[PDB]
Amino acid sequence: SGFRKMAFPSGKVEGCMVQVTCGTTTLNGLWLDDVVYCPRHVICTSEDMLNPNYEDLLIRKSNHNFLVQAGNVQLRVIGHSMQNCVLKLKVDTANPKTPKYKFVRIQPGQTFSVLACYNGSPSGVYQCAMRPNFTIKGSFLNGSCGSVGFNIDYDCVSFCYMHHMELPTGVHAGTDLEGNFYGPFVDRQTAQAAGTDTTITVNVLAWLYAAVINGDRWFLNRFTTTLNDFNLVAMKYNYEPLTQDHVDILGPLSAQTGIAVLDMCASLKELLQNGMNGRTILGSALLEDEFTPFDVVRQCSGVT
Amino acid sequence: SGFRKMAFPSGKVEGCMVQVTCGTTTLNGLWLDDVVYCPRHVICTSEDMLNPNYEDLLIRKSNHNFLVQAGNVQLRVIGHSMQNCVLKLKVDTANPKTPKYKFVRIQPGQTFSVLACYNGSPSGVYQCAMRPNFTIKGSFLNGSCGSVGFNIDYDCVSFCYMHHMELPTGVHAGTDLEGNFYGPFVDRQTAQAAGTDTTITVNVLAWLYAAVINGDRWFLNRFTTTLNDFNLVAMKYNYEPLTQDHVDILGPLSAQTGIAVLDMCASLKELLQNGMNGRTILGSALLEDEFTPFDVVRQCSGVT
Numbered sequence: 175s176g177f178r179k180m181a182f183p184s185g186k187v188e189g190c191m192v193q194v195t196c197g198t199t200t201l202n203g204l205w206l207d208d209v210v211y212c213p214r215h216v217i218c219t220s221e222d223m224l225n226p227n228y229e230d231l232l233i234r235k236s237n238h239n240f241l242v243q244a245g246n247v248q249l250r251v252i253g254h255s256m257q258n259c260v261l262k263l264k265v266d267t268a269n270p271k272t273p274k275y276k277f278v279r280i281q282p283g284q285t286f287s288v289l290a291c292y293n294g295s296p297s298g299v300y301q302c303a304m305r306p307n308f309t310i311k312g313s314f315l316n317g318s319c320g321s322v323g324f325n326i327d328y329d330c331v332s333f334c335y336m337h338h339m340e341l342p343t344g345v346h347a348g349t350d351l352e353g354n355f356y357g358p359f360v361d362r363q364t365a366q367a368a369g370t371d372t373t374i375t376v377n378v379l380a381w382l383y384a385a386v387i388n389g390d391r392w393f394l395n396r397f398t399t400t401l402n403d404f405n406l407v408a409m410k411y412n413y414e415p416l417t418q419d420h421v422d423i424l425g426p427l428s429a430q431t432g433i434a435v436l437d438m439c440a441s442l443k444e445l446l447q448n449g450m451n452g453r454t455i456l457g458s459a460l461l462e463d464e465f466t467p468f469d470v471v472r473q474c475s476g477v478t
Numbered sequence: 479s480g481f482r483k484m485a486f487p488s489g490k491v492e493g494c495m496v497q498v499t500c501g502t503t504t505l506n507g508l509w510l511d512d513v514v515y516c517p518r519h520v521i522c523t524s525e526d527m528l529n530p531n532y533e534d535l536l537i538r539k540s541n542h543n544f545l546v547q548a549g550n551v552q553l554r555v556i557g558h559s560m561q562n563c564v565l566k567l568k569v570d571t572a573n574p575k576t577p578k579y580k581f582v583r584i585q586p587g588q589t590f591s592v593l594a595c596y597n598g599s600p601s602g603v604y605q606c607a608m609r610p611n612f613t614i615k616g617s618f619l620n621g622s623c624g625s626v627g628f629n630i631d632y633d634c635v636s637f638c639y640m641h642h643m644e645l646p647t648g649v650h651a652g653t654d655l656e657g658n659f660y661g662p663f664v665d666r667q668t669a670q671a672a673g674t675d676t677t678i679t680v681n682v683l684a685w686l687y688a689a690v691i692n693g694d695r696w697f698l699n700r701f702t703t704t705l706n707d708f709n710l711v712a713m714k715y716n717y718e719p720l721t722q723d724h725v726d727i728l729g730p731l732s733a734q735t736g737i738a739v740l741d742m743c744a745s746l747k748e749l750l751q752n753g754m755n756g757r758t759i760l761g762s763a764l765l766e767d768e769f770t771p772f773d774v775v776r777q778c779s780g781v782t
């Protein structure tokens with residue numbers, strides 16, 4: 175029992191982190207097979223960020239201008255190309271620690287672990303979610319660029335995020351490993367404001383199920399609702415609309431606890447309207463939305 | 479910017495996890511050099527747990543009764559001894575992945591990362607603290623026994639916890655790596671209730687400093703206090719007393735923000751008395767106490 179914001183074991187990803195320097199800019203790279211992936215803004219000076227023309231700045235760079243260091247040994251760069259907002263640096267040595275891997279583009283509401291790195295060295299691991307406005311609420315300082323987000327399914331690492339930017343509001347933006355930003359963000363030091371950070375309803379419901387499984391049951395009420403009535407309340411509270419697809423995804427948790435999905439929706443509706451009244455759920459005074467239904471099943475079943 | 483509950487990168491500890499089976503009981507072990515450390519209750523049946531005499535149960539066990547599996551390869555056990563509540567299984571092969579390590583016994587209020595494991599395989603990593611009542615609030619299911627808690631200082635892993643037990647209240651108890659339980663807990667299936675789970679004041683103050691550093695400043699008030707006046711309020715709210723030692727430890731955060739420690743104490747005093755009023759601090763509706771002052775400096779400075 176007990177429920178924690180848990181990240182995947184980071185060992186498989188630590189074995190991939192390298193340092194990439196181009197001139198005076200140093201950031202993190204991800205070394206998989208004989209390719210090192212990193213944010214293309216490694217070629218920019220702080221002045222270039224204001225209005226960068228990446229294709230033009232890249233013309234002034236050669237293979238020998240990209241310095242890749244794995245641990246404390248230099249890797250030989252034999253090719254370089256830009257794919258969207260990432261650079262792929264072909265090196266002459268395949269990463270001996272390359273795990274089985276995939277590149278995936280996640281949907282808002284999906285969670286992943288981040289291995290925050292500086293100078294190609296890991297500093298920490300934490301769990302976060304792709305917000306409905308396509309930002310992530312991470313913990314990243316200058317030099318954290320190129321740190322990656324991932325999920326693990328047994329022995330296969332699915333990389334889903336590479337860190338690129340911090341918005342003026344302290345929220346973060348990045349790309350998938352094909353270099354495509356999540357949301358409308360661009361790798362330029364310009365005014366970019368985030369949209370509404372709505373609450374991930376299906377994740378809140380999954381966490382209410384985790385609370386029941388772990389003995390926190392005070393919030394269970396004697397009511398039920400419908401998807402339409404629930405969604406009227408959810409919209410008013412800036413929660414994402416709940417669909418029949420989400421109800422289907424919650425099926426296993428509904429079966430485990432014997433609490434119908436719509437009954438849990440009615441409990442969540444009363445929590446939204448009445449508040450917590452100074453009480454806590456799984457040690458939190460707010461409704462947690464960065465656990466997916468899959469994360470709840472995984473943590474409560476002990477998948478390794 | 480951004481502040482997350484961050485765990486240490488778990489790779490160095492993943493390379494140490496093994497599966498230990500004795501008869502019908504299987505749990506996790508920690509393999510460092512040619513010794514595998516595990517909870518001594520691996521020798522017990524569920525019936526033995528009610529009133530175990532470990533020295534007597536151990537007489538019936540030989541080296542060949544302890545099955546140690548690293549990955550999917552069997553290790554040869556050439557010696558076994560009980561030290562307090564842990565068994566040390568001497569194996570014929572030194573762990574090739576043994577990191578630089580120390581065994582430390584932490585104080586209440588100190589934080590560490592846990593690598594939750596099942597069958598010698600890592601499932602996840604999370605951060606927690608040694609509570610003032612010597613329990614930890616982890617996430618552990620049956621078979622998680624032998625999972626360890628640790629801190630990392632550059633390349634040295636300081637192991638501080640090994641999981642042994644879940645109390646009837648869902649809280650957890652365990653030992654240091656010398657086998658000595660934290661607090662008054664015993665490895666027996668008997669009535670063991672925890673004492674008061676007080677709030678770790680110095681950690682709350684450190685997290686209020688992290689909030690100021692990351693731009694959350696609404697709670698800063700125009701007041702100051704004294705250690706004695708603050709402590710009168712802290713006692714009433716089940717917070718640990720703040721000492722001059724804690725004020726000294728907060729010195730670097732006080733210098734970074736320009737907010738005197740006693741001024742932050744006065745802000746915390748108003749938060750305790752007035753509540754949050756539906757507001758949040760670093761995305762939390764309650765005051766967080768599982769970040770030490772060292773963790774705040776580390777996360778806000780980017781130590782790898």
Ligand SMILES: *CCC(=O)N(C(=O)[C@@H]1CCOc2ccc(Cl)cc21)c1cncc2ccccc12
Binds near residue numbers: 201223341363479
């Ligand atoms: C890896 C550091 C970095 O590049 N960060 C930035 O956000 C850049 C600063 C200048 O503006 C800018 C525009 C676009 C892009 Cl793609 C990147 C930047 C950065 C990333 N995460 C956190 C940070 C904290 C503090 C400073 C810089 C940060």
Ligand SMILES: *CCC(=O)N(C(=O)[C@@H]1CCOc2ccc(Cl)cc21)c1cncc2ccccc12
Binds near residue numbers: 175622624665
């Ligand atoms: C590793 C599983 C385990 O032994 N757990 C226990 O708490 C044991 C169950 C019987 O009572 C008991 C008394 C003393 C000791 Cl030292 C251990 C036990 C265990 C540990 N953490 C979480 C658990 C969750 C669910 C079942 C058992 C758990």
